Amino acid sequence: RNMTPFTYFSLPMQKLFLRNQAAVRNKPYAKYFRSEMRVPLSAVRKIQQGPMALEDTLTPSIEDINRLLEPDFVSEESGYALLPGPMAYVQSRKFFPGCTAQMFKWWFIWHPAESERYTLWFPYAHVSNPCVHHQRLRDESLSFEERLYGNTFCASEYVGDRLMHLHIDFQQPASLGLNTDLYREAKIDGSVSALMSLADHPEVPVSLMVHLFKEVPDGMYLTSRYWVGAHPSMARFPGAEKAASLLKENGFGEAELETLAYEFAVHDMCEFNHLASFLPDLYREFGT
C-alpha cells in the first residue's frame, strides 16, 4: 500500500536513461517508458541498515533452495548479504497487483524482441537482452518452458554503477536441484530461475537465480533468490568450479561482492515493482 519513489540513480545510470529515452521516443509503447520507479517503503527500508545476519541467509545448496518449497514458508520482502564463498546474496518477494501467470510469461516472450522493450522494465539500467534462439522463443508449438529454457539470454545492464554483460540460461527447476514433488505440492505457477555467467567466460557459472511465481486472487507474487560468486555447492553445475579463480582474476573480491549484493537488491526491487505497475495494462494493449 505505501509505495515510495526511488530517489537515487548512479551517474552512469542517469546517462543511460537519457540514451534510452531518445531510443524509445518513436516506439508504439513509448507511453510506458516512465522516469518514476516506486518501491514498497517497507522493503526499501529493510535494505538501508546493513547486510542481513548470516543466520537468516541461504546458500545455493540443495537444503537451502528447497526451503523455498515448504508449505509454511513465505519469503521476506528484501535483504542482502555477503556469504563465505565469497558470494553476493539477495532475497526478495514482490507483489504484482492484477497480474496473472500468463501475463508474466508473456512478458518474457515479448520483451526480448526489441531492446527498447527491455528498457521499459528498468529505464535507468537496461541496455539489451537478445536471446540466442529467437525463433524458438516465438515458437507456439512449444510450451513456455521449451521456448525459454536452454535459450541463453545475453543481458547488458548496469548493476549500481557497473555495466554488466550477463549470459542468462533459464533452466528446469528440477535440473537446478529443486525437488519436483515439493515443487508440485507448493502449487507454483511458473519459474524463471536460471544459471548465469559473465560474458567474459560464458561457460563458467558464477550465479544461480531462483524465481518462483504463484497467483493469488488479486494478482501474483514473485519469490526470488540471487547468488553471485563462488561456493562449493555450485560444483554440481559444470564449469562452476572455475568461478573462484575467474572472480579473483577479475575484480571480484569480498568487498566488491558485498557491494554487488546491495546493488543487486536495489536493482531487483526497482525493476520488478516497476514492471508490476504497468504489466497488466501493457499486456492488454500489446498482447495483440
Give the torsion through C-alpha atoms of 23, 167, 92, 90, to 10 deg.
Answer: -120
Residue from 125, 230, 244, 266 in contact with its own copies (CB under 8 A)? 266
How does DSSP classify residue 143?
Answer: -
Which residue ranges are tagged as binding site for Zn(2+)? Answer: 126, 157, 267, 271
Q: Do 190 and 144 meet the contact criterion of CB atoms below 8 Å apart?
A: yes
**Residue 94 backbone phi and psi in degrees, to 5:** -110, 145
271 near Zn ion, rule: CB under 5 A? yes
The binder of 271, among Cl ion, Ni ion, Zn ion, none, by C-beta within 5 to 8 A per type, is: Zn ion
The CA-based diameter of the chain, rounded to the nearest angstrom, is 50
CB-facing half-sphere around the CA of 122: CA atoms within 13 A: 24
CB of 260 to Cl ion, least distance (A): 22
42 near its own copies, rule: CB under 8 A? no
Rounded CA-CA distance 89/265 in Å is: 9
**Residue 258 or 271 having the CB closest to Zn ion:** 271
Residue from 233, 259, 273, 277 in contact with Cl ion (CB under 5 A)? 233
Where do we find the cell 515458437? 139
252 near its own copies, rule: CB under 8 A? no
Rounded CA-CA distance 212/229 in Å is: 21
Contact segment (CB under 5 A) with Cl ion among 1-9, 61-69, 118-126, 180-188 equals 61-69
CB of 120 to Zn ion, least distance (A): 11
Contact segment (CB under 5 A) with Cl ion among 7-15, 57-65, 188-196, 219-227 equals 57-65
Closest to 222 in 3D by CA, of 232, 211, 231: 211
**Residue 215 or 271 having the CB closest to Zn ion:** 271
93-122 positions binding Zn ion, by CB under 5 A: 122
Contact segment (CB under 8 A) with its own copies among 5-13, 93-101, 228-236, 239-247 equals 5-13
**Residue 8 or 181 having the CB closest to its own copies:** 8
Task: Write out the H or E segment, with its range, that includes residue 195.
Answer: strand 194-198
Peptide bond preceding 123: is omega within 30 degrees of 0, i.e. cis? no
The binder of 262, among Ni ion, its own copies, Cl ion, none, by C-beta within 5 to 8 A per type, is: its own copies
263 near Zn ion, rule: CB under 5 A? no
Rounded CA-CA distance 288/180 in Å is: 34
CB-facing half-sphere around the CA of 166: CA atoms within 13 A: 23
CB of 81 to its own copies, least distance (A): 11
Rounded CA-CA distance 160/13 in Å is: 8
Site residues for its own copies per CB under 8 A: 4-11, 14-15, 17-18, 35, 39, 41, 44-45, 48-50, 161, 258-259, 262, 266
Site residues for Cl ion per CB under 5 A: 61, 233
